Ligand binder design. Sequence first.
Ligand SMILES: Cc1ncc(C[n+]2csc(CCOP(=O)(O)OP(=O)(O)O)c2C)c(N)n1
Ligand SMILES: Cc1ncc(C[n+]2csc(CCOP(=O)(O)OP(=O)(O)O)c2C)c(N)n1
Ligand SMILES: Cc1ncc(C[n+]2csc(CCOP(=O)(O)OP(=O)(O)O)c2C)c(N)n1
Ligand SMILES: [Mg+2]
Ligand SMILES: [Mg+2]
Ligand SMILES: [Mg+2]
Lengths: 579, 579, 579
Amino acid sequence: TNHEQVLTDYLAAFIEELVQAGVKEAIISPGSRSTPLALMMAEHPILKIYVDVDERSAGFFALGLAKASKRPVVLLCTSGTAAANYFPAVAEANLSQIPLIVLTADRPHELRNVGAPQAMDQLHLYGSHVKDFTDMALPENSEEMLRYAKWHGSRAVDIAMKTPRGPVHLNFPLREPLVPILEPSPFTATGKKHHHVHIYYTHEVLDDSSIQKMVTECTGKKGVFVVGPIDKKELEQPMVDLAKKLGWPILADPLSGLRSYGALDEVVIDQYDAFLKEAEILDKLTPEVVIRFGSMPVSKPLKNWLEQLSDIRFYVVDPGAAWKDPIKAVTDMIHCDERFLLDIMQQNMPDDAKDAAWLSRWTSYNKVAREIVLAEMANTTILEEGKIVAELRRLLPDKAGLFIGNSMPIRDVDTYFSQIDKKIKMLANRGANGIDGVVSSALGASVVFQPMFLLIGDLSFYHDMNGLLMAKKYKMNLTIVIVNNDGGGIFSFLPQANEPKYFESLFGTSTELDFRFAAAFYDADYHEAKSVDELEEAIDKASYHKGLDIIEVKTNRHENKANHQALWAKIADALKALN
Amino acid sequence: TNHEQVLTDYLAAFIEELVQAGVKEAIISPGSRSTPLALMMAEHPILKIYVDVDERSAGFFALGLAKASKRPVVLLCTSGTAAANYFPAVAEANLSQIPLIVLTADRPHELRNVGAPQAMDQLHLYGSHVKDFTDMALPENSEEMLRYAKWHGSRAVDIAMKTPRGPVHLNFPLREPLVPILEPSPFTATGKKHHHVHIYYTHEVLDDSSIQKMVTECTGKKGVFVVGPIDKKELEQPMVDLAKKLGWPILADPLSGLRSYGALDEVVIDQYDAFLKEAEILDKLTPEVVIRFGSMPVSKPLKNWLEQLSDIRFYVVDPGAAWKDPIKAVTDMIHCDERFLLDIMQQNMPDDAKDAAWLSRWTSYNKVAREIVLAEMANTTILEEGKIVAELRRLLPDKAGLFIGNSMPIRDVDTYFSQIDKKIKMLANRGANGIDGVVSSALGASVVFQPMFLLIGDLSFYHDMNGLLMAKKYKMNLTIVIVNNDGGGIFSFLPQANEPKYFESLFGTSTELDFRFAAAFYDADYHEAKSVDELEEAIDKASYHKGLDIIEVKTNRHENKANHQALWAKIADALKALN
Amino acid sequence: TNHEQVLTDYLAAFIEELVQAGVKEAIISPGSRSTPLALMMAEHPILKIYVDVDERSAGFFALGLAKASKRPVVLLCTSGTAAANYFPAVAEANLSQIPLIVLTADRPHELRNVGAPQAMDQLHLYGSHVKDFTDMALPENSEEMLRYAKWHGSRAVDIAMKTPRGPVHLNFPLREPLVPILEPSPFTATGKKHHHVHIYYTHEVLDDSSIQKMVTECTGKKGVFVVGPIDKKELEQPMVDLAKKLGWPILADPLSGLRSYGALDEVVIDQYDAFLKEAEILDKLTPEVVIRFGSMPVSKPLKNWLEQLSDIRFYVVDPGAAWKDPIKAVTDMIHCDERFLLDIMQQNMPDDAKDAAWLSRWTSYNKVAREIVLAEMANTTILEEGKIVAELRRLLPDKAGLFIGNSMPIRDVDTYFSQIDKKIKMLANRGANGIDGVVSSALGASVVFQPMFLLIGDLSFYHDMNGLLMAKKYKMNLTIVIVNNDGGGIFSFLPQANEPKYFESLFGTSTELDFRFAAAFYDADYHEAKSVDELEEAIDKASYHKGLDIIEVKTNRHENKANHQALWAKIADALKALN
Ligand SMILES: Cc1ncc(C[n+]2csc(CCOP(=O)(O)OP(=O)(O)O)c2C)c(N)n1
Ligand SMILES: Cc1ncc(C[n+]2csc(CCOP(=O)(O)OP(=O)(O)O)c2C)c(N)n1
Ligand SMILES: Cc1ncc(C[n+]2csc(CCOP(=O)(O)OP(=O)(O)O)c2C)c(N)n1
Ligand SMILES: [Mg+2]
Ligand SMILES: [Mg+2]
Ligand SMILES: [Mg+2]
């Protein structure tokens, strides 16, 4: 009894502090060693629990939920290889700056590295892929240890939510017996117990000298904004307003939110991946200033171009000093909040240093290429990869969420998803660009945004098929469009597709999986879209179905390259003739 | 020749970027594998070089120089155990937030973990004791690799200087031949080469909602400032002004600069370590708000007291989110720049919510205890430990630097160094409180502050005796006062001094070293102070000697406890009788 | 009392098991957090204690003691940077396979990574430089925890003594109070307590098929033994006997023991470093089989030669699978005990497959070069570096220990120390070849071997001058010969000595230290040897002095290269003319 009471007081002070620090959800995996942490978080009247038996799927589920809500999400698993399954989501959360509080149970010291069953060295388990690691003490209920448990609870959340955000790992060695005292409840009916650690909201700010320096050096310059994947509060309207004020184009990634923030503007460029391939056009586009926001864009033609830009002022806005610059072209590094920098320029830059011909050159190429793409997709009935993205852009409701898988789906959105006057929250795992856990990440984001849709390739869908168990047992609403080209279509473009001897076994891995059976395994409505009218009917059915939908579109891998190169050629020819 | 030219271009782009990022000094240790980095930094016309053959002493030398100048200092050593000798200074720089750029040469990949001579695994050599680690590529002079070398040069300094500051480690695998091309020079006479990465000055700022919350909750409260070891720009006058505006006492550590910033004030409390021992007095001192600045103070009576303060608002100002709170008593954590918080309250707090009786209670106990200490030291001729500190407080010139060793010297400054109207820059290694490398740290700080003095115990002086070689070969000016009590006097107070069986062998380690010979080994003027007049004459001689001075004062270890407890009792008796 | 009794039972079970596992000595550094471990090891009636206040010197002291006695030696230090000072000795013990049991005290969990005084992250402190790491639990005296403490005590020693031997690290978080119960004694007067874990002696053995394979492929081959630094039991006579049986030369490093095992033989080659420089001679020396023992030899001419040997069978004997092969020339890797392989060939190889002309070619070049060196040193009166080694070879008593420093001293022994019919145990730190801690390592080895001598350069002597404090307080007997060339003489041979602009500041670091004062600081008899007769008289005085002796010989750095190249030329000319 004394042992169980110590175990209860120790974890109650830690769990209550997680809730008071802003944790609302906890994704738990079943286990015997994690029993005291799992039971008490379920007993907590505010913490919402999601139980996932696949630890790999559970990690990405919590990852998507945190990525969509900007909220710190708790993960719990038992000792052993269950904690090793968190590594893909932890590495992705570290490179994408997602606040995951990873709690892993462990054997006590007497059962560590002694060959005990379900025992594993978990000290610094994730290496440098967490912002901080803590090996908690064995449960003690003394005054200093109860305040030590609350201290680490507030510290874990604060370090995870501190810019640059990222995952934190806490290891809990737990000694048997493992059943705490839940009656009476350890969170409620405990008077004179509140001792919350309030954390104040802070943000980084440029000096007055730094502000004057950049305002002076950016006035009257032919500048270009490059906004890659970035998910901060708002920021979509302030970026457009500053670009209108300066007359600068915004090379906007699909994941920047600028292609679908609810309105149309004349500064967002969404065809750069297309026309930056043309050499005869880059002459008139050479800028003097480049100001980067967020991560690096998916566009590889946007890369290379920025890589060869010589004798320019290349600003990079990096609030956390993460130093994400894969081209190493940075000339001026800025470590301040993006919202602050946008406002501080909005009311300091001159209101009339706008070379109209500069923005006219970018918007001309962009709007001409934009309509050639929309023309080729409107006049086709073959449901090619680009057509799937085009019809999604047309059929998605306002205030809808769209999770985009890596590989071809994210690159096809960059090519075939122009700016539209609807609010579409777009997410993707762009830390390591892994095809793993995409289904769970979308399901976690479906807790926040509704209606939620997922554009994903076939290989990636198989990878995290287990995620769908969360959709089945929690009655979740998600519409999954599978671009089943039966293998890896990303490898038809890369130069390995010309050697046919070992292709289709090392790269284009054919699966021949009938996803209709997988849709039945997870209680999902299945539709095979063979025509444009069928794909429509399926999407319209998915809105009237509050549940899991799967819309498979079989495409041809060996025809993608020709379709994309035919479109890119028609764009280059038209833009070459422009004066 | 092509190999040597590649080696020259690669390192020149890296070294020039370190200089342009603010590096002015480089402490180098001799070695064959570090040849190309050592020769090129010496060839650089701006980088100043200090050569130290003891790598342990070299690390602490650079540590003191960075700690005194707020400048990022480069360390260079060769492959092998030479890099292992950096670990004490690196661990101290990490816990004390000092920007050290640790560069360690290494064997190329073909000579790594193959039993090669002077080869050692140096990947993540310092573990979590560096903010970042980089294993540089083998030298390449391609366009991308030359920009990669400059990129890491600017990144290393920026990450090290970014709050919370700390050391960074870069490993350089270097392949033979190792002699670069210095004629013509690779830094000058190289046109169209400037591509510096300018970093802008940023700082953290509280939100408007956070400012309003704290101003409201601190108005009219019986608050107390606790300023431990902190070395930021200025901050000494703003703290006193805010405390005068609010009527709050400042429990000021010696290393906070508030005991010697050039003026006298009526809010700094420098006797708390004395009177917080008395139980009958703490009744009238119980506060409602505690606002902490800097690290944790050396005073252990200031600890315990703050540890048992219940039902208070315990603010902790932590610009880097380092979470330094060994008592875990934090109620409100603040992650903003200290200067910003001081100003934002200076002009938001009410100018008239001052309970005069509150500050009167603290200053009464402080000024009475302050004069009892000064009376006991003025009326004594025995050169006890407290008397040495007292006479230093009287004889030090204005705008002088005083490095204080750990163990008893730092605690005797806290007891016997009241606030004085002189500007005395006080430093100490308070990250891990190691008695190692204190001499080198003082010598590094002597490059910045002059005249420089060092109060150090005998065991600590022996520990880093090799540091004095830097003073001999570089004609450095430092006056070292050795409190030779022949062992560890810190262990006479702790409860291990009552068992005499194994004492004097495990704790009070007698050395019987005649430091007169050590002073001759390093070309230093030696003085043995036996009386107060002799200690004076020696200090006055040290100012007229531009060089190294060593003033030894032999004290009795077994009489320290009685002297300190007699003084503390006379203070407690007087303050008990106060109404 | 209950807390102190738990602390006593916990550590007593651990310390007693270290003693029963073969630990006889413990090198302790003073500290407050290490109080319970330090007091109890002193209380133990079998464990011998050495107290060293320099943790860096303490590590190398224990390193030398373990390297000389083949016994596992315990290190103890307090929490903080004191444990960081162990890193050079730990890295050297890992690369040289020395069984060090590194015990570091630590703060309890509530004081870990919270900014506590003298606190430092010590989890995996030494990274990959230890064979194993253990973070011990807080003291508990339950039945399972007392057996857990004994378990780790037996496991630490066993893992450290297991081939390949190496250091192990155990971290002890200790909570106050820290004073255990020593009266009554916790080791004696404790009936029904013996539960020792006996470890049986095991060794690796080749299969019958592996034995038949190598005996067949080595019969009648022109083979060569290469024995680098190796310190196993005996092995000196078995190697010579097998080489006599096969007719194979033994290219023997000075640290192989084959140049001074008590007798003269006709198979040990000690001039290879000299004559392998000559190109016209290597023609007749090309072998078919190379069998390597121990580490890689210091000779760089022995390197390169073995590196370009093509189409040979290069065997490497590696009992621990450490894979020490810096030339990567291995063709047949053998993971068995050296003694077993020597015997198994001694009685399986044919007794008559000896090409007399093969061994005659090696011994001819060796004996001619050997006498040219001895002639040049016998006919000179200038006390050059080679002459110092020559006179040491003549004046050292039988059954004497000689510690050799790195840099030039070890290379001068390889050149000027021919095989002699005296038993001279030669040691050196050849893991990383660091010039640090050489004095302490020699002093630790002086506990085992007597009389002990140390040949060391001036820079290396200064590096670990603090080691001499152990000689002063423990009345140790060691005769130190300092080859003071006032800087780094190793850099006059390397190709950096032709650029005089930055030489003598980066490589030849002149110190101008009068080591006579350092000898007085440590109560040592000092002699300056200016002639050959003076160096003799000093050595003869050192045998009649039971204590610390220091014999300084000032040499010229800028004349070493010419002296060595003149000798090497006279050898090459004579050996070129040989038929
Ligand atoms: C976890 C993971 N495994 C492997 C890869 C390598 N990879 C990149 S794209 C790709 C093909 C994925 O195919 P699919 O999801 O069907 O996309 P599409 O066919 O539309 O290109 C693979 C295996 C990866 N990025 N992440
Ligand atoms: C590197 C290091 N080793 C050991 C310790 C443990 N320690 C703390 S205080 C102390 C005594 C130092 O003695 P000294 O410098 O002479 O001071 P005083 O006698 O004035 O107390 C020791 C060994 C430490 N803090 N750092
Ligand atoms: C700890 C360490 N620091 C630096 C080096 C680089 N190093 C190799 S040899 C040498 C010179 C040492 O000089 P000394 O001991 O006087 O030898 P000698 O002059 O006889 O060559 C140095 C600094 C090293 N091997 N180990
Ligand atoms: Mg696919
Ligand atoms: Mg002392
Ligand atoms: Mg020398």
